[PDB]
């Protein structure tokens, strides 16, 4: 432990990720285990891709993509020290943010990294997606939420939300 | 096989000189090849000596 949890958009599959490298994908309502990995490494977050068939894990340095059974398909060298993972299900974009202060959009269908955006605000404390328009809301330690689009290098909106870190 | 060699290393059968090496990632120099040998009191070493009928139990095999 501790375990960071994620649900499929259907909600039929659950993806748990321990801090000490125990990452499991299961059909929680059936009680059927799809995959189980013991990475023996620090793991921070995981997300499902367009199905339960593929999932991404943000490990100690690099982000890895595994299939349904649990074999490693990809090791994304460009995504470094990501703590927050997200998936835009209509754009097929996996979005990573983390300790480096860079927001990265990667196309999971073609494999081409779509965008590298420099947040310039230190490590990203929080990250959410707007499901309405696929704009990423990042939370920084200066107390501002910034709104990001892959086609623009600067944030669309900066909101001064909190005094301390968000 | 290399996998057999990996398992024999982790199981404590291999020494490079007097020193036991249980790390498979250990890199061997051309000079250091000449001292990569079975550890004494190894069941593998006893097996090969017993196969050749040359096992001496005074030497511990």
């Amino acid at each position: 432990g501790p375990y960071h949890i994620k649900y499929a958009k259907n909600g039929t599959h659950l993806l748990i990720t321990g801090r000490k490298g125990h990452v499991a994908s299961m059909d929680w309502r059936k009680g059927q285990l799809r995959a189980e990995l013991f990475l023996n490494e620090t793991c921070h977050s995981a997300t499902y891709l367009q199905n339960e068939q593929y999932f991404a894990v943000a490990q100690k340095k690099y982000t890895f993509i595994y299939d349904h059974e649990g074999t490693e398909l990809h090791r994304l060298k460009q995504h470094i020290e990501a703590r927050h993972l997200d998936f835009l299900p209509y754009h097929y974009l996996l979005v990573t943010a983390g300790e480096t202060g860079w927001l990265k959009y990667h196309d999971v269908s073609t494999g081409q990294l779509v965008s590298e955006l420099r947040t310039k605000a230190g490590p990203t404390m929080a990250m959410a997606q707007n499901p309405w328009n696929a704009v990423m809301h990042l939370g920084h330690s200066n107390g501002t939420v910034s709104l990001w689009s892959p086609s623009m290098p600067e944030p669309l909106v900066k909101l001064l939300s909190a005094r301390g870190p968000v | 096989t290399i996998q057999d060699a990996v398992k024999f290393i982790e199981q404590g059968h291999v020494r490079v000189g007097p020193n036991l090496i249980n790390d498979p990632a250990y890199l061997v120099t051309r000079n250091m090849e000449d001292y990569v040998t079975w550890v004494d009191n190894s069941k593998i070493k006893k097996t090969l000596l017993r196969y050749r009928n040359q096992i001496d139990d005074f030497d511990f095999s």
Partner: protein
């Protein structure tokens, strides 16, 4: 003889944790691994505590009375120690990892920062006896959201200031009645708050952050409340504040950064008094003594300790230790100094009485593998892996000659003849032994005839015959002096790893791979003895081992052995967790010493807790460095399969417990071991045991004092030797008059005369009675010099100790006196007019 107690941990000054001054300002306490070392900087006297934590120490504190020491390791396990008695009073387990421990200025209470919580406990009375639970909880305060970085008592014990990782500092009151005066949370910081301090009076509060901001809080009007009056910033951009301390009477703020930089500031003016750099590694701890003259900075990487006087820009102390890095040690021919060779290429000279390094030699460009002295104490020789053997004068600190083969080969063992003309070295790359002359740097010879790598070399101190032995299971004895040049080989069953010469030079002892120590005679190549040492060895199980420590064969042998100077015992060590002492005529084990009890080391436990083993594997092998706060902590710079690592490439596996070199002291009944934690010095004190010699019913201390009053001085001295008690021997020895000294010294029995020589040698170096001790030495040398001359090896330790007394103090006194006399003669005899 057999009894040895752990005296010193030499060669390390700071591992990690809090360093604390004593209240009088004379003693510095520093954590070295799981042990605490105290250095007395005024009396130049260092000792270490015998007790061990099971892991590395995270915090220590000493009482203001100097009577109690509380030391907490990582994972929160405390030991409470009687400081003056040097004995452990209690063991406590605080279940959470503790950041700070601090006694009250009264000393009645102590505060502890464990997690979010602040625990105040009542300090037990030191004059009370040991009881089952001596700690009474005063309070537990739980206002912080995250882990407490630090805590500070006020000068009166009423208030405590706590700083935590949730970017705030709280004020707490010891009294529930006074809790209304202390209910404030101080906010506004953008990072971890590193310290909160009161002014010299209670009215001002200073809070310091990780990103480098100092806030001054005052209780002022805009009713009345605390507010930030003034914000000051350190503009060190890359460096983050690693530590901070504050002396309120001097108003001195000392800050240590991640860049290796420490700054001295004066508050509340924020005036930069000073700005210096320890090095490149972070400054991990800062302390200041009570009167405020001395600051002490500790850096964990490379193990650097630094006591700085700051009013005068002067370094009281600048030391660097060596952890998991020592390959060889050699005593000086007087046992006052130990010289260590290190894997980073440094040769260091450590005083034994004060635990500090005297000199460092850095000409070697790779790991130094061996260090030896000549019979003359002024020359040492060192062999390194870089391909050179160097000779050092310790008078000028001069590398006066270097020795190089034809090609570059990695020298691993080193020997030098007694009359210092010939130096031999052996290598693992080559099967030959390279022989150089000292006066001329050219190589005389390359001895051939070993079918494996020459693992060990020695010169006989009297015959001047060279015994080498190798991994080809042979010991070759070379007579390289003379016209003959004959070599005689001896075959052993197994691979020879260590070798030692008897000080007589008649016999050679050999430690092999099969766990045996075999002793051979040199004149006829006959095996006169054998010791089976394999079962005595304590071998642990590593966290990565898939095989039992019983079935492991990593360390079931000894890689270093050494003879006692009387030739009767052998100390032995290896890559194990045991140091074994043997009596060679009886071929039996006298005593065994556990090298380390540190679970942070690897092979210290034979069995491992099976709760750690999961279906993934060990929980101790999970790569958890990614959870760290800093990128420098998170970065994995390692190369795959490196056996030891490097300065820039740190190894993945934990350090292993091992002893690389054991030696006996030429001067005292002590031995040194070069191990992972440092230099283990085990010594014998005769004040502890009761060991009578030729005792009788009539022989009592009362009877000895009665004979002293009856003025039967020879009888009193003989009875004191028969009782063998240091205080009573000292009493009689100082009670004998000067006129009676020749008669008593002439009539001392021949059996007790090693005892009186050993006593005088031990006593005379610290005692102030220089003329009395010299008269005793003169009387004993006049009476029985011939007996000593016949029994060289029985008397060698005592005579070397006496010579150390005569050279080390008496010559300095005489030199000062003669310089005064000649200066007086000049100043009076010569005219200085106009």
């Amino acid at each position: 003889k057999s009894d040895f107690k752990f005296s010193n941990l030499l060669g390390t000054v700071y591992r990690q944790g809090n360093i604390t001054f004593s209240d009088d300002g004379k003693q510095l306490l520093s954590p070295v691994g799981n042990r605490v070392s105290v250095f007395d900087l005024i009396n130049n006297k260092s000792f270490t505590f015998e007790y061990e934590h099971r892991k590395n120490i995270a915090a220590i504190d000493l009482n203001k009375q100097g009577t109690l020491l509380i030391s907490i390791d990582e994972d929160g396990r405390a030991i409470l120690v009687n400081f003056k008695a040097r004995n452990v009073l209690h063991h406590f387990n605080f279940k959470e990892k503790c950041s700070a421990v601090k006694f009250s200025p009264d000393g009645r209470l102590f505060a502890l920062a464990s997690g979010r919580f602040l625990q105040i406990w009542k300090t037990p009375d030191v004059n009370k006896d040991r009881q089952f639970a001596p700690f009474v909880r005063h309070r537990v305060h739980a206002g912080h959201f995250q882990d407490i970085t630090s805590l500070t008592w006020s000068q009166d014990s009423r208030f405590i200031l706590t700083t935590s990782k949730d970017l705030s500092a709280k004020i707490w009151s010891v009294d529930s009645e006074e809790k209304n005066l202390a209910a404030t949370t101080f906010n506004g910081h953008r990072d971890y708050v590193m310290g909160a301090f009161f002014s010299h009076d209670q009215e001002k509060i200073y809070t310091v952050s990780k990103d480098g901001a100092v806030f001054v809080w005052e209780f002022t009007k805009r009713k009345y409340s605390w507010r930030i009056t003034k914000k000051h910033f350190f503009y060190a951009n890359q460096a983050k504040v690693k530590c901070v301390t504050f002396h309120p009477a001097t108003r001195l703020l000392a800050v240590g950064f991640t860049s290796g930089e420490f700054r001295l500031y004066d508050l509340p003016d924020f005036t930069l008094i000073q700005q210096l750099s320890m090095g490149q590694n972070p400054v991990n701890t800062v302390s200041v003594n009570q009167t405020g003259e001395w600051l002490a900075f500790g850096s964990s990487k490379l193990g650097q300790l630094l006591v700085y006087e700051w009013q005068s820009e002067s370094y009281i102390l600048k030391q660097q230790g060596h952890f998991d890095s020592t390959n060889s040690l050699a005593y000086s021919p007087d046992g006052s100094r130990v010289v260590t060779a290190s894997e980073d290429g440094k040769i260091k000279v450590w005083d034994i009485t004060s635990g500090f390094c005297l000199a460092t030699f850095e000409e070697h460009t790779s790991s130094v593998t061996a260090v030896q002295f000549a019979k003359r104490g002024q020359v040492m020789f060192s062999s390194s892996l870089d391909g050179t053997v160097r000779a050092w004068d310790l008078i000028r600190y001069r590398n006066f000659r270097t020795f190089t083969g034809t090609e570059r080969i990695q020298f691993n063992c080193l020997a030098v003849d007694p009359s210092g003309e010939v130096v031999c070295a052996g290598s693992l790359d080559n099967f030959d032994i390279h022989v150089w002359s000292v006066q001329t740097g050219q190589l005389l010879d390359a001895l051939s005839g070993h079918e494996g790598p020459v693992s060990c070399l020695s010169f006989s101190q009297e015959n001047s015959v060279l015994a080498s032995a190798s991994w080809d299971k042979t010991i070759r004895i070379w007579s390289i002096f003379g016209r003959s040049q004959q070599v005689e080989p001896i075959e052993v069953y197994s691979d020879v790893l260590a070798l030692s010469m008897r000080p007589d030079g008649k016999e050679v002892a050999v430690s092999t791979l099969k766990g045996q120590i075999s002793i051979f005679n040199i004149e006829d190549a006959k095996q006169v003895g054998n010791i089976d040492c394999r079962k005595d060895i304590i071998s642990g199980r590593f966290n990565q081992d898939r095989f039992t420590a019983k079935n492991s064969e990593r360390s079931k042998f000894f890689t270093t052995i050494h003879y006692s100077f009387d030739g009767m015992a052998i100390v032995a060590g290896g890559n194990n967790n045991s140091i074994c002492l043997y009596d060679v005529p009886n071929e039996v084990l006298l005593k065994r010493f556990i090298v380390s009890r540190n679970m942070a080391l690897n092979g210290t436990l034979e069995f491992l807790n099976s709760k750690k083993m999961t279906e993934a594997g060990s929980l101790d092998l999970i790569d958890d460095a990614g959870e760290n706060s800093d990128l420098e902590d998170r970065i994995d710079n390692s190369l795959p399969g490196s056996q030891r690592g490097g300065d820039l490439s740190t190894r993945k596996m934990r350090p292993e417990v091992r002893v690389t070199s054991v030696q006996f002291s030429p001067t005292a009944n002590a031995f040194a071991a070069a191990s992972t934690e440092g230099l283990l010095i085990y010594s014998t004190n005769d004040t502890i045991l009761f060991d009578p010699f030729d005792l009788d019913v009539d022989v009592t201390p009362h009877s000895t004092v009665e004979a002293l009053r009856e003025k039967q001085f020879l009888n009193a001295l003989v009875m004191a030797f028969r009782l063998n008690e240091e205080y009573l021997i000292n009493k009689v020895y100082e009670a004998i008059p000067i006129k009676e000294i020749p008669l008593v010294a002439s009539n001392i029995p021949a059996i007790y005369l090693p005892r009186i020589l050993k006593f005088i040698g031990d006593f005379a170096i610290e005692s102030q009675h220089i003329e009395f001790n010299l008269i005793w030495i003169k009387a004993l040398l006049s009476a029985s010099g011939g007996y000593i001359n016949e029994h060289k090896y029985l008397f060698s330790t005592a005579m070397r100790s006496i010579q150390r007394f005569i050279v080390r103090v008496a010559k300095e006194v005489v030199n000062t006196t003669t310089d005064n006399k000649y200066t007086y003669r000049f100043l009076v005899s010569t005219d200085g007019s106009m």
